[PDB]
Design an enzyme around this catalytic site. Structure first.
Site, mmCIF file in Angstrom:
data_model
loop_
_atom_site.group_PDB
_atom_site.id
_atom_site.type_symbol
_atom_site.label_atom_id
_atom_site.label_comp_id
_atom_site.label_asym_id
_atom_site.label_seq_id
_atom_site.Cartn_x
_atom_site.Cartn_y
_atom_site.Cartn_z
ATOM 1 N N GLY A 253 0.789 -1.219 0.000
ATOM 2 C CA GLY A 253 0.000 0.000 0.000
ATOM 3 C C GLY A 253 0.829 1.281 0.000
ATOM 4 O O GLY A 253 2.056 1.238 -0.138
ATOM 5 N N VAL B 296 6.939 0.300 6.174
ATOM 6 C CA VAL B 296 6.349 -0.601 5.180
ATOM 7 C C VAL B 296 4.831 -0.549 5.197
ATOM 8 O O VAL B 296 4.232 -0.595 6.271
ATOM 9 C CB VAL B 296 6.774 -2.057 5.461
ATOM 10 N N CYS B 297 4.213 -0.445 4.018
ATOM 11 C CA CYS B 297 2.778 -0.587 3.909
ATOM 12 C C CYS B 297 2.337 -1.865 3.264
ATOM 13 O O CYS B 297 2.564 -2.088 2.041
ATOM 14 C CB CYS B 297 2.190 0.531 3.106
ATOM 15 N N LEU B 298 1.671 -2.713 4.041
ATOM 16 C CA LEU B 298 1.226 -4.010 3.570
ATOM 17 C C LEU B 298 -0.140 -4.271 4.197
ATOM 18 O O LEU B 298 -0.351 -3.976 5.381
ATOM 19 C CB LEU B 298 2.248 -5.077 3.982
ATOM 20 N N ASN C 231 6.217 0.460 -2.193
ATOM 21 C CA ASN C 231 5.353 0.389 -1.001
ATOM 22 C C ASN C 231 6.008 0.681 0.329
ATOM 23 O O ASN C 231 5.469 0.360 1.393
ATOM 24 C CB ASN C 231 4.514 -0.889 -0.985
#
Lengths: 78, 61, 156, 157
Positions: free
Chosen positions: A78, D91-93, D84
């Protein structure tokens, strides 16, 4: 004609399957998702590092006895 | 039949209680039951620096 | 004092009524060492943009005086400026949570002008190009200005 | 308080016994030398057979008091080039977001393997940084070059 496969989650969950060496591997995934009670599109199944296509067959992937399939939660950056 | 479930790893009552308390996966402690398990391994002093060192630069099987 | 009032409640009338010194005054008022504050000032100023020649010039001159001062500073990180600008225009996500502004027409026309100026660091153009091209609904509401900016960026 | 420390202690005990090869996950030390279970240092190998191969990427994992209810915050130290990952290194997850696919049953081991998977499988539709997005989209060859240079830079001593 017939082999045993171990499907292992990253959550430590483990299910073993008797699978026909000529079968479409999505049947394994359906059965597994059916058992865990989660949608088919919520999980990813890997063998030897690579994604398993619904039409892939244990023969075509060169799956031996007691080989391991790893399963991961579906995710997106994201 | 094309595919048949012949086995499912299921925790003991005790292992499941322990996992549930911590909201862990119910099979989380099953690594403790198998021929390979030695035991604690009670003292954990290792730091990040030495753990990276113990890799000896080898990242892959 | 009226310059401060303009920044708090921007209108094209107040911008004009500041007179020919508006550009310098706005630049002086702004802390041009801080990318977030520069973005804020750039958006306040460009929010009053109109095609009308007098407003158009006032907006462009204020942007120029503001961004020339920012970009020519040693302590101004121009990459952080671009990132925060894209964030505030709702084109790029952020860890902190921001209000994307609703109307991008003014910002886009001001960018069109800014991006052609000698002070504008050209290494930023590809980033801007990437994010103005990337599908966004708010950009679609401004399609003419968006299109103009894209054309300009391709020549930079 | 909460199960955070109890759980984190168990995850640490389990990690020492059973963990993926080539990965590191260790609780940091407080200044006085005691273990800090709420803050871990981790290292993720790039996947063999990808431009990430050979890199060992250091990551900080920060747990709040309400863990497992909330996910940890994961930050590459130093920040990594990747669509990302934020400039800050964060971190974007999806599985790391409480409003999203995070569930308490997700563990540290599962998180690290997830982040490893993310390295070579970015979501370009929703980038966390302008830089890696722009290069990825404009020049993929240049993108892979930067990845390889970065993997080399972080290759273990």
């Amino acid at each position: 004609e017939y082999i045993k496969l171990k499907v292992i989650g990253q959550d430590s969950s483990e299910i073993h399957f008797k699978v026909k060496m000529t079968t479409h591997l999505k049947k394994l995934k359906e059965s597994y998702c059916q058992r865990q009670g989660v949608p088919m599109n919520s999980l990813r199944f890997l063998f030897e590092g690579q994604r398993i296509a619904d039409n892939h067959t244990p023969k075509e992937l060169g799956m031996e006895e007691e080989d391991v399939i790893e399963v991961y939660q579906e995710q997106t950056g994201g | 039949l094309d595919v048949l479930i012949v086995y499912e790893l299921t925790p003991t009552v005790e292992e499941k209680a322990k996992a549930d308390t911590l909201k862990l996966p119910p099979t989380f402690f099953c690594y403790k039951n198998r021929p390979d398990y030695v035991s604690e391994e009670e003292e954990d002093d290792e730091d990040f620096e030495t753990a990276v060192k113990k890799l000896n630069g080898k990242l892959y099987l | 004092a009226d310059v401060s009032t303009f920044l708090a409640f921007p209108s094209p009338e107040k911008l004009l009524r500041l007179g020919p010194k508006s550009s310098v005054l706005i630049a002086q008022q702004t802390d041009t060492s801080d990318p977030e504050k520069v973005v804020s000032a750039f958006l306040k100023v460009s929010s009053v943009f109109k095609d009308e020649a007098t407003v158009r010039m006032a907006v462009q001159d204020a942007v120029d005086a503001l961004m020339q001062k920012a970009f020519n500073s040693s302590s101004f990180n121009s990459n952080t400026f671009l990132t925060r600008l894209l964030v505030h225009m709702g084109l790029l996500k952020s860890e902190d949570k921001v209000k994307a502004i609703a109307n991008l027409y003014g910002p886009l026309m001001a960018l069109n002008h800014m991006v052609q100026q000698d002070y504008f660091p050209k290494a930023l153009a590809p980033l801007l190009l990437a994010f103005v091209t990337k599908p966004n609904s708010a950009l679609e509401s401004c399609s003419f200005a968006r299109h103009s900016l894209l054309q300009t960026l391709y020549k930079v | 308080s909460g199960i955070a420390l109890s759980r984190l202690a168990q995850e640490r005990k389990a990690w020492r016994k059973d963990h993926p090869f080539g990965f590191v996950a260790v609780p940091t030390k407080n200044p006085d030398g005691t273990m800090n279970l709420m803050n871990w240092e981790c290292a993720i190998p790039g996947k063999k057979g990808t431009p990430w191969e050979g890199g060992l990427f250091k990551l900080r994992m920060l747990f709040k008091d309400d863990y497992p209810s909330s996910p940890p915050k994961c930050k590459f130290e130093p920040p990594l080039f990747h669509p990302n990952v934020y400039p800050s290194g964060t971190v974007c997850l999806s599985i790391l977001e409480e409003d999203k696919d995070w569930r308490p049953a997700i563990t540290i081991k599962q998180i690290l393997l997830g982040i490893q998977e993310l390295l070579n499988e970015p979501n370009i539709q929703d980038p966390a940084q302008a830089e890696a997005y722009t290069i990825y989209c404009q020049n993929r060859v240049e993108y892979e070059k930067r990845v390889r240079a970065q993997a080399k830079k972080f290759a273990p001593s």
